[PDB]
Amino acid sequence: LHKEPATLIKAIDGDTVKLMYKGQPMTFRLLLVDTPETKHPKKGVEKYGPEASAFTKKMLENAKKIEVEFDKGQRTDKYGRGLAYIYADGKMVNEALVRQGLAKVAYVYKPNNTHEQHLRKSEAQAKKEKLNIWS
């Protein structure tokens, strides 16, 4: 696994972001995490949805360097979104969301599961501290 540089274009949701990656605009979906929805009219704005989106936005907007990390499996989903681990100045947004209790560790599909243990460890901590989702 290796990181590649990307440039932010627009944060769309806690778990979905648009980046410029190798000269092309691309929508990225954050691997292994599910943040509460602000979009989908299924229901509307779930609780901590606006909070998760603001966290992702801020972390990405205030960064010096953004990097995308592809996992070992397929690199895009059926909607055409890149599937990756996103890093803001060396810190993984995916993990930070979970550690802050703003995201669940999603259903994991091998072999796209390399940082799974790390994230479930972070989700257990957030559960212990009863943060946001877990309170």
Is residue 75 flagged as an active site residue? no
* From 29, 51, 95, 123, active-site residue: 29
* From 69, 81, 116, 120, active-site residue: 81
Question: Is 89 labelled as part of a ligand binding site?
Answer: no
* From 37, 51, 67, 123, active-site residue: 37
Is residue 29 flagged as an active site residue? yes
Residues in CB range of 72: below 8 A, 6 or more apart: 1, 111, 112, 114
CA 24 to chain centre: 20
Is residue 120 flagged as an active site residue? no
Question: Is 77 labelled as part of a ligand binding site?
Answer: no
Q: What DSSP designation does 89 have? A: T
Question: Is 71 labelled as part of a ligand binding site?
Answer: no
Catalytic residues: 29, 37, 81
Query: Annotated binding site: which residue ranges?
Result: 15, 34-35
Query: Annotated binding site for Ca(2+): which residue ranges?
Result: 15, 34-35
